[PDB]
Amino acid sequence: GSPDLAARTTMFEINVGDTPCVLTKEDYRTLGAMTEGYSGSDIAVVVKDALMQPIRKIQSATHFKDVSETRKLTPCSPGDDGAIEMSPDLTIKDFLKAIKST
Amino acid sequence: GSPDLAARTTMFEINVGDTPCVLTKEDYRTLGAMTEGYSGSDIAVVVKDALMQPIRKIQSATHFKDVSETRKLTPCSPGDDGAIEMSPDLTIKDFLKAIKST
Amino acid sequence: DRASKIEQIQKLAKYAISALNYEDLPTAKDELTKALDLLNSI
Amino acid sequence: DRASKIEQIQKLAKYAISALNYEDLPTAKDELTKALDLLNSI
Questions:
Q1: Computed over its alpha carbons, how large is the radius of gyration of chain B?
Q2: Rg (CA), chain A
Q3: How many CB pairs below 8 A link B and D?
Q4: Beta-carbon contacts of residue D29 (< 8 Å; ≥ 6 apart)
Q5: What is the CATH number of the domain that holds A46?
């Protein structure tokens, strides 16, 4: 038998561990259910894919905005006040993406 | 004084040398004039940029068509008979591109 | 869907770009369109 | 021009893609348009 939304909740925790983020418990409860029928390796892969995301955002997105400490430019649409054409945080939305892409 | 469409013609030759292509003399006469006021390093850079092109075509273009010997897929639009979504020759048009991009 | 529709526009707009690399205006004017219509379908 | 107009559509269609990476439909529906109109200007 595989983890049950309960065992899958903690699995997401463990793999994230200390990695600087802010998914509140609420968020994990969600990713636990999204994964009904998933396995440890699965959920574990899943989380490895998320992350490496904040990095992809800055790798592909060529347009950074300043949110500054002195200065701190990051990936932005360009219709965001200040978009500076030139080549971020782990929201629950990031773990969301890598759910489909796997 | 700098090369004069005559000296610039040969300069394009020299830098291409043996590199497998087919720009007939006609074509060189053209790139010689396009370069009015250019220098040796210039024309020389120019040619280094062209080439590395046939390679870029296959690096960015994700869609290859079969023109086969057994099989020989290459970069194609996808509205070209057979486009196979999956990740060429040096026409005068290639030296043309790197004239603007420099 | 949606999370995907938003992903397929990009898929289109890429092909379109890739197409202009052969000056193929036909394909382009089409994919860059199938894409736009879909961003309105959002 | 033209050799550039064809190059600026791609420039647009890229920004558009880059924009959907923040779900910014506004920018997108615009750049993916300024681009298309221009492919007809060709």
A1: 16
A2: 16
A3: 3
A4: C36, C39, C40
A5: 1.10.8.60
Instruction: Please answer yes or no on whether C6 and D23 come within 8 Å at the CB atom.
Output: yes
Q: How many Å from the N-terminal Cα to the C-terminal Cα in chain C?
A: 10
Specified resolution (Å): 3.1
Contacts of residue D27 in chain A, CB cutoff 8 Å? 77-79
The superfamily in CATH containing domain D1-42 is Immunoglobulin FC, subunit C (1.20.5.420)
Question: What approach was used to elucidate this structure?
Answer: X-ray
DSSP B75: E
CA-based nearest residue to B5, from B33, B46, B27: B33
User: Could you tell me if A20 and A90 are in contact, meaning their C-beta atoms sit under 8 angstroms apart?
Assistant: yes
Domain ranges for chain D: 1-42
The structural domain count of chain B equals 1
* Residue D16 touches partner C, C-beta closer than 8 Å: yes
